Scaffold this active site. Structure first.
Site, mmCIF file in Angstrom:
data_model
loop_
_atom_site.group_PDB
_atom_site.id
_atom_site.type_symbol
_atom_site.label_atom_id
_atom_site.label_comp_id
_atom_site.label_asym_id
_atom_site.label_seq_id
_atom_site.Cartn_x
_atom_site.Cartn_y
_atom_site.Cartn_z
ATOM 1 C CG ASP A 1 40.144 44.159 26.514
ATOM 2 O OD1 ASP A 1 39.337 44.533 25.263
ATOM 3 O OD2 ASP A 1 39.629 43.983 27.882
ATOM 4 C CG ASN B 1 41.681 48.600 28.742
ATOM 5 O OD1 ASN B 1 42.547 48.799 28.011
ATOM 6 N ND2 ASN B 1 41.381 46.850 27.942
ATOM 7 C CG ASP C 1 42.680 46.513 33.505
ATOM 8 O OD1 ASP C 1 42.911 45.630 34.922
ATOM 9 O OD2 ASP C 1 41.197 47.058 33.552
HETATM 10 C C1 LIG Z 1 36.554 54.609 33.978
HETATM 11 C C2 LIG Z 1 36.149 55.240 35.240
HETATM 12 C C3 LIG Z 1 36.102 56.861 35.170
HETATM 13 N N1 LIG Z 1 36.021 57.850 34.945
HETATM 14 C C4 LIG Z 1 38.110 55.126 35.089
HETATM 15 O O1 LIG Z 1 38.802 56.129 35.165
HETATM 16 N N2 LIG Z 1 37.940 53.226 36.284
HETATM 17 C C5 LIG Z 1 37.046 52.201 36.241
HETATM 18 C C6 LIG Z 1 37.272 52.074 37.439
HETATM 19 C C7 LIG Z 1 38.592 51.618 37.938
HETATM 20 C C8 LIG Z 1 39.433 52.610 37.852
HETATM 21 N N3 LIG Z 1 40.887 52.913 38.268
HETATM 22 N N4 LIG Z 1 41.325 51.191 37.967
HETATM 23 C C9 LIG Z 1 43.232 50.758 38.055
HETATM 24 C C10 LIG Z 1 44.332 49.702 37.805
HETATM 25 C C11 LIG Z 1 43.611 49.099 36.548
HETATM 26 C C12 LIG Z 1 44.189 47.434 37.532
HETATM 27 C C13 LIG Z 1 45.162 46.955 37.974
HETATM 28 O O2 LIG Z 1 46.177 45.575 37.848
HETATM 29 C C14 LIG Z 1 46.526 45.458 36.910
HETATM 30 C C15 LIG Z 1 47.260 46.733 36.378
HETATM 31 C C16 LIG Z 1 47.682 46.488 35.142
HETATM 32 C C17 LIG Z 1 47.749 45.077 35.018
HETATM 33 C C18 LIG Z 1 46.751 44.032 35.243
HETATM 34 C C19 LIG Z 1 46.514 44.366 36.226
HETATM 35 C C20 LIG Z 1 45.644 48.285 39.368
HETATM 36 C C21 LIG Z 1 44.426 49.291 39.276
HETATM 37 C C22 LIG Z 1 42.781 52.459 38.400
HETATM 38 C C23 LIG Z 1 44.496 52.804 39.293
HETATM 39 N N5 LIG Z 1 45.456 52.748 39.220
HETATM 40 N N6 LIG Z 1 44.545 54.481 39.270
HETATM 41 C C24 LIG Z 1 43.080 55.872 38.949
HETATM 42 N N7 LIG Z 1 41.866 54.445 39.118
HETATM 43 C C25 LIG Z 1 42.165 53.101 39.270
HETATM 44 C C26 LIG Z 1 39.526 53.341 36.892
HETATM 45 C C27 LIG Z 1 34.890 54.761 32.503
HETATM 46 C C28 LIG Z 1 34.024 53.179 33.429
HETATM 47 C C29 LIG Z 1 34.497 55.921 31.831
HETATM 48 C C30 LIG Z 1 35.545 53.179 31.278
HETATM 49 NA NA NA Z 2 40.441 39.879 25.022
#
Ligand SMILES: *[C@@H]([C@H](C#N)C(=O)N1CCC[C@@H](n2nc(-c3ccc(Oc4ccccc4)cc3)c3c(N)ncnc32)C1)C(C)(C)C
Ligand code: NA
Ligand SMILES: [Cl-]
Ligand SMILES: [Cl-]
Ligand SMILES: [Cl-]
Ligand code: NA
Ligand code: NA
Ligand code: NA
Ligand code: NA
Ligand code: NA
Ligand code: NA
Ligand code: NA
Length: 268
Positions: free
Chosen positions: A131, A136, A149
């Site tokens: 994905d 992401n 992700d």
């Molecule tokens: C995105 C908006 C805006 N503006 C946005 O930036 N985010 C949406 C809300 C979540 C925010 N966020 N998520 C993580 C995060 C992601 C994944 C994991 O776990 C994993 C990692 C790797 C592999 C598998 C699973 C953990 C954490 C964030 C982090 N680390 N830092 C900052 N923000 C994070 C992002 C739209 C809605 C406009 C697309």
């Molecule tokens: Na998929």
């Protein structure tokens, strides 16, 4: 929780909300007082937790500069936590759409290299993202893009997101063989990376915007391909377009793509 990647939830503090979309709610906080972390709380009843927790160690042991750094997990409790480094510039999609940034194509190409390096690594570990998209990818304080992700799609329970014909399926980033025959491979990630390059050089525009998801699916099979963005040179467009060969085995690898990208970079 017992395991080399198990984090003690008592070592966590929750300070600010970040968003509630991809696979669960996400919180900013501190780990052991010192480290800024983002904590993703997998929505209870989100996926095959026996399956995820089982084949999680493979994901966790992945290590590359251009993958968002996973610090650990909390699997004893529910909801399952996933703890990563904090990425101060958020999702790449929002980062691209922010009009105050005024990107140069030099920066856009660098974003493409960052992600390609990460995907090259995953390809060498036979680990599919499934994905890939700007929504992401994450961006840190220094403007470095990292993949996030990765592989989580495998354990999605909702057929609305799992089935190609599903409502929440990422049709717009999918090749013909996925939409028609649900054939995921290294070459489907290649296709998706091509659409991501198009997202980047389009400064975050939606792919195939004039079409709905069912119309896009209908047009992809039948040979619709993304046009050349204004900011993309012919050489850049050639790179992303090479990712969309109808026959999967005719598409390049991420090693080849990275090489192409580095050549263009050397040409400025
Ligand atoms: C995105 C908006 C805006 N503006 C946005 O930036 N985010 C949406 C809300 C979540 C925010 N966020 N998520 C993580 C995060 C992601 C994944 C994991 O776990 C994993 C990692 C790797 C592999 C598998 C699973 C953990 C954490 C964030 C982090 N680390 N830092 C900052 N923000 C994070 C992002 C739209 C809605 C406009 C697309
Ligand atoms: Na998929
Ligand atoms: Cl900028
Ligand atoms: Cl999938
Ligand atoms: Cl050119
Ligand atoms: Na903050
Ligand atoms: Na690295
Ligand atoms: Na600038
Ligand atoms: Na950049
Ligand atoms: Na495929
Ligand atoms: Na065109
Ligand atoms: Na050109």
């Amino acid at each position: 929780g017992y395991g080399s990647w198990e984090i003690d939830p008592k070592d966590l503090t929750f300070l600010k909300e970040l968003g509630t979309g991809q696979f669960g709610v996400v919180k900013y906080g501190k780990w052991r007082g010192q480290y800024d972390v983002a904590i993703k709380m997998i929505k209870e009843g989100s996926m095959s937790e026996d399956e995820f927790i089982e084949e999680a160690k493979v994901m966790m042991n992945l290590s590359h500069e251009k993958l968002v750094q996973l610090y650990g997990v909390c699997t004893k409790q529910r909801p399952i936590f996933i703890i990563t480094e904090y990425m101060a510039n958020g999702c790449l999609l929002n980062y691209l759409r922010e009009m105050r940034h005024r990107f140069q194509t030099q920066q856009l190409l660098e974003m493409c290299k960052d992600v390609c390096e990460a995907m090259e690594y995953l390809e060498s570990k036979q680990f599919l993202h499934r994905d890939l998209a700007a929504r992401n990818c994450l961006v840190n304080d220094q403007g470095v893009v990292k993949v996030s992700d990765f592989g989580l799609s495998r354990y999605v329970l909702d057929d609305e997101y799992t089935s190609s014909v599903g409502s929440k399926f990422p049709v717009r980033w999918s090749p013909p063989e996925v939409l028609m025959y649900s054939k995921f491979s290294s070459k489907s990630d290649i296709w998706a990376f091509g659409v991501l390059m198009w997202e980047i050089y389009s400064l975050g525009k939606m792919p195939y915007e004039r079409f709905t998801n069912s119309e896009t699916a209908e047009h992809i099979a039948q040979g619709l391909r993304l046009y050349r963005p204004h900011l993309a040179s012919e050489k850049v467009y050639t790179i992303m377009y090479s990712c969309w060969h109808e026959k999967a085995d005719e598409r390049p690898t991420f090693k080849i793509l990275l090489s192409n990208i580095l050549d263009v970079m050397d040409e400025e």
